[PDB]
Design an enzyme around this catalytic site. Structure first.
Site, short mmCIF file in Angstrom:
data_model
loop_
_atom_site.label_atom_id
_atom_site.label_comp_id
_atom_site.label_asym_id
_atom_site.label_seq_id
_atom_site.Cartn_x
_atom_site.Cartn_y
_atom_site.Cartn_z
N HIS A 118 0.90 -1.21 0.20
CA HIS A 118 -0.07 0.06 -0.06
C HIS A 118 1.09 1.14 0.01
CE1 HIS A 118 -3.08 2.98 1.13
NE2 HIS A 118 -4.02 2.10 0.86
N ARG A 153 -3.11 1.36 -3.68
CA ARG A 153 -2.88 -0.31 -3.86
C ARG A 153 -3.63 -0.66 -5.13
NH1 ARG A 153 -6.93 -3.27 0.20
NH2 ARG A 153 -8.09 -1.14 1.03
N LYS A 179 -7.30 -0.52 -6.93
CA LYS A 179 -8.37 0.32 -6.15
C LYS A 179 -8.15 1.69 -6.85
CE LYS A 179 -10.11 -0.57 -2.48
NZ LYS A 179 -10.52 -0.11 -1.13
N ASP A 225 -6.91 8.84 -5.29
CA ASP A 225 -7.10 9.50 -4.12
C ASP A 225 -6.07 10.81 -4.04
OD1 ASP A 225 -7.64 10.56 -1.58
OD2 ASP A 225 -8.01 8.57 -0.65
N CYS A 264 -5.19 12.03 -1.34
CA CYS A 264 -4.20 12.22 -0.55
C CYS A 264 -2.93 11.27 -0.74
CB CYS A 264 -4.67 11.64 1.05
SG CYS A 264 -5.36 9.97 1.17
N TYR A 265 -3.04 10.48 -1.76
CA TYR A 265 -1.65 9.88 -2.11
C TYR A 265 -0.77 10.80 -2.92
CZ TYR A 265 -4.43 5.79 -0.33
OH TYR A 265 -5.45 4.99 0.32
N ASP A 284 -10.54 13.76 -1.75
CA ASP A 284 -10.11 12.64 -2.19
C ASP A 284 -10.19 12.56 -3.52
OD1 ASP A 284 -10.35 9.91 -2.99
OD2 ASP A 284 -11.69 9.37 -1.38
N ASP A 295 -11.79 17.50 3.37
CA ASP A 295 -11.47 17.88 4.83
C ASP A 295 -10.15 18.12 4.95
OD1 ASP A 295 -9.76 15.46 4.75
OD2 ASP A 295 -11.26 14.28 4.19
N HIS A 331 -7.30 15.74 3.46
CA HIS A 331 -7.09 15.75 2.03
C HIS A 331 -6.46 17.16 1.46
CE1 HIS A 331 -9.35 11.83 2.20
NE2 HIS A 331 -8.43 11.61 1.21
#
Ligand SMILES: CC(C)=CCC/C(C)=C/CC/C(C)=C/CONC(=O)CP(=O)(O)O
Ligand SMILES: [Cl-]
Ligand SMILES: [Cl-]
Ligand SMILES: [Cl-]
Ligand SMILES: [Zn+2]
Lengths: 335, 5, 452
Positions: C244, C292, C295, C298, C300-301, C356, C363, C366
């Site tokens: 991940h 990962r 999936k 997003d 935040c990655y 995201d 939020d 993020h």
């Protein structure tokens, strides 16, 4: 207020919240807690300060968990009380299952499960409906990372690598969604993960070796390897652009000490292109395992297809591979 | 929804 | 549709399997939500749109969102009780990225964390919560960002060292709190706190892990992290779990606290499998990173995966000498254009904050990490032979420097498609705060005697 009016709680004085406000500058990111949560947590501060192991304290932890299941401190204190009082942990698991069904993405509920289930005095063998409960969770989110992490721990703890429900549950999840990478990852653990109880846990064998050899099995069961490769090919044919079985097969070949060229013809069968993974597989076969005759050029052609058409966002990595292959080929020509 | 702890 | 937007960001991928499963339904839905935003035609988007067809970073909107996020929340937010130090960190980090001076928050940070510190050591989520490495990391990074001797003085360093020593496990890793889970967050957060507070390398003399033959905080640690690599090449939270991006960041950043990237990362990780798995995190047309395999992307990655890149790139390039002639670099091995499009075109909320993905409310978590990733694409980050630390242990970690990677013109495989008006402050790729903030706290602590 429920605790302060209850004579069950009369023998202990709660410890009021001090968040630093009206002890200085005003604190940041405050939460205007409900009266019920303020009161419960003030009693929790008092019981924990006294190191109180009691039935009332146990009920208090359940009440706080009902309000905020992400309060990591109250779960750790709950587990201390359960062990100190010799509580029935079968009954605790049935309560925990209800909490788990109500709340997703939570470290505490699944850590608490591992704390309880690790007690061999209480759970000497795999409980008879434990795997079914994990499948209740996966029916709601088949990729739930914390539940898969717990299931990896459960397999190591009860030595379940060859237990037929572990493979059957992975196969049911892969029948429902062959792209479920969490199920492929657990499959790798069941089939190829290290099992020696005298070594620390690892995702791969041979972590004491050079890092290029990470994953190599000390002893290879060749028929198992063949079976797992055939399984992987059959799943790939259902959905050839699905990365997961291609990555699993690379991992199986690395574990077995076998070359990517074992799948050269299979990869060519998808190349008019039905799988970008087949093109990357071919680039590696021609680059790394073929020492001939224009093999370097063919690898570069595959990488060019990826960078221009079939996976162009990763162009800079494909061009890095082209540079490595071109340098390697130049080194070969030079000697 | 992302969770870190 | 704007002429500066390449087809790669305007159409789904060429290859499409016939079989539909839940994975492809969610992937297709995500692509279809992102496409109008990538194209710049969605009515929620504010300009100006640059020459590459990408909206400006909405700096004033995000500043107001982050300032508001530091004030009081209603009762319904009770689940964030354990995360209050994180909410301080995410907001200060976003404000710093956007160029605010957060000095004026020193007193309120002191108020907040004095109450959350336990007398036995470490910081928890708030009064009465046991110490946890994530809240201690968030608090230390917050203190570093506001600076000043009073804030630095609040921390009980000796008690922090004793408490962190309790978390060290026989297998070389760290639990996140006493009685809590062991995973690579524990290792990374504990070692960042250890490094920034210049704690002693030796374990406390009473640390349980000494009974298992370990002597220092780093003993058995890179071996533990090597055991978290997976067959996919990525790194999981604990051995055998799924690779991940969030846990790859924690592991690679922790390895870079142990020595030079080009020594430690190839020794303990198989880079041949790590590199393609990290590259495969990025999708088109969305342009962002997933955490990962199979999936979804997003924002935040943009930090957790994005900031793996300077670490891996340093492992391949080696340390840059300040004296020597400039050496060759492998450059950026991912698409900065794609990431920048995803953050600016898809992750900005019209009312402020970042998210995201389309369809999610913003939020401050993020918002912090999408901004952090946008900053990464705007700089060359590299390690050098010149450290601000006077000591050897973490010397390389304090050697990271940065040069701007300026906004580009024209098409290209490695280009800056933000405008210079969108430029954020550089962040240190391991400590996730400005370099000067990490330097100043480490140097202050280096110059304080360890408490009796
Ligand atoms: C320094 C810190 C505390 C690092 C950890 C940060 C992250 C984001 C932890 C990730 C843990 C994760 C795998 C939680 C499981 O739920 N999250 C998801 O499933 C999200 P995705 O679908 O993107 O994997
Ligand atoms: Cl051992
Ligand atoms: Cl406590
Ligand atoms: Cl919006
Ligand atoms: Zn996220």
């Amino acid at each position: 207020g429920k605790y302060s009016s209850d004579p069950e709680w009369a023998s202990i004085k709660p410890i009021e919240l001090n968040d630093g406000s009206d002890f200085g500058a005003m604190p940041l990111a405050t939460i205007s807690y409900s009266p019920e949560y303020l009161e419960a947590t003030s009693y929790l501060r008092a019981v924990m300060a006294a190191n109180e192991m009691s039935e009332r304290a146990l009920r208090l932890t359940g009440d706080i968990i009902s309000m905020n299941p992400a309060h990591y401190t109250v779960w750790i204190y709950r587990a201390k009380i359960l062990f100190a009082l010799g509580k029935d942990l079968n009954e605790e698991i049935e309560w925990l299952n209800k909490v788990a069904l109500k709340h997703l993405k939570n470290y505490q509920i699944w850590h608490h499960r591992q704390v309880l289930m690790s007690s061999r005095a209480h759970f000497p063998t795999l409980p008879p409906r434990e795997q079914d409960f994990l499948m209740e969770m996966f029916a709601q989110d088949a990729k739930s990372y914390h539940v898969w992490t717990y299931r990896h721990w459960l397999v190591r703890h009860f030595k379940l690598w060859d237990h037929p429900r572990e493979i059957q549950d992975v196969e049911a999840l892969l029948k429902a969604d062959v792209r479920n990478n969490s199920a492929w990852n657990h499959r790798y653990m069941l089939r190829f993960g290290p099992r020696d109880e005298n070594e620390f846990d690892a995702g791969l064998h041979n972590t004491t070796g050079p890092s290029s050899e990470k994953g190599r099995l000390p002893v290879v069961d060749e028929d198992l390897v063949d079976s797992e490769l055939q399984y992987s090919q059959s799943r790939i044919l259902e959905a050839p652009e699905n990365r997961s079985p291609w990555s699993y097969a690379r991992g199986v070949l690395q574990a077995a000490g076998r070359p990517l060229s074992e799948w050269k013809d299979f990869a060519r069968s998808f190349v008019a292109v039905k799988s970008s993974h087949a093109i990357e597989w071919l680039a590696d076969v021609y680059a790394e395992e073929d020492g001939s005759e224009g093999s370097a050029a063919e690898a570069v052609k595959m990488l060019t297809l990826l960078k221009e058409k079939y996976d162009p966002i990763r162009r800079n990595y494909w061009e890095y591979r082209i540079r490595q292959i071109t340098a390697s080929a130049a080194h070969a020509t030079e000697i | 929804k992302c969770v870190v702890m | 549709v704007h002429p500066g937007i390449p087809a790669l960001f305007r159409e789904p991928p060429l290859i499409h399997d016939l079989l539909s499963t839940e994975t492809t339904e969610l992937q297709s839905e995500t692509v279809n939500k992102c496409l109008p935003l990538l194209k710049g035609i969605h009515n929620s988007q504010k300009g100006p749109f640059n020459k590459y067809g990408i909206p400006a970073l909405q700096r004033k909107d995000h500043l107001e969102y982050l300032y508001d996020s530091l004030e009081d929340y209603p009762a319904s937010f009770v689940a964030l009780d354990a995360s209050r130090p994180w909410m301080v960190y995410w907001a200060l980090a976003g404000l710093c990225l956007l160029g605010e001076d957060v000095t004026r928050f020193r007193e309120r940070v002191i108020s907040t964390f004095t109450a959350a510190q336990n007398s036995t050591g470490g910081i928890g989520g708030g009064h009465g919560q046991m110490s946890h490495v994530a809240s201690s990391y968030a608090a230390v990074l917050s203190i570093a960002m506001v600076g000043g001797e009073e804030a630095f003085k609040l921390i009980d360093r000796k008690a922090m060292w004793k408490w962190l020593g309790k978390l060290k496990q026989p297998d070389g890793g760290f639990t996140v709190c006493e009685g809590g889970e062991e995973d690579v967050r524990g290792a990374y957060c504990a070692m960042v706190v250890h490094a920034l507070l210049d704690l002693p390398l030796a374990l406390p003399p009473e640390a349980e892990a000494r009974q298992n033959g370990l002597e220092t905080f780093t003993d058995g640690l890179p071996e533990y992290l090597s055991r978290c690599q997976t067959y996919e090449g990525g790194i999981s939270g604990s051995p055998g779990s799924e690779a991940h991006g969030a846990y790859a960041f924690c592991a690679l950043a922790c390895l870079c606290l142990l020595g030079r990237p080009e020594v430690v990362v190839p020794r303990y990780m198989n880079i041949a499998t790590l590199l393609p798995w990290l590259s495969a995190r990025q999708y088109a047309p969305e342009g962002g990173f997933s955490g990962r395999t199979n999936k979804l992307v997003d924002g935040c990655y943009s930090h957790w995966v994005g900031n793996c890149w300077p670490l891996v790139q340093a492992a391949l390039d080696g340390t840059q000498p300040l004296a020597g002639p400039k050496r060759s670099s492998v450059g950026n091995l991912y698409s900065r254009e794609g990431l920048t499009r995803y953050i600016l075109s898809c992750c900005q909320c019209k009312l402020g904050g970042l998210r995201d993905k389309p369809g999610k409310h913003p939020d401050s978590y993020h918002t912090c990490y999408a901004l952090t990733g946008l900053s990464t694409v705007q700089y060359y980050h590299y390690c050098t032979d010149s450290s601000v630390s006077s000591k050897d242990d973490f010397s390389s970690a304090f050697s990271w420097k940065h040069d701007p990677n300026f906004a580009s013109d024209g098409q290209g495989s490695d280009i800056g498609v933000f405008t210079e008006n969108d430029r954020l402050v550089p962040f240190h790729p391991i400590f996730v705060i400005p370099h000067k903030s990490a330097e100043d706290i480490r140097v202050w602590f280096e110059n304080q005697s360890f408490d009796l």
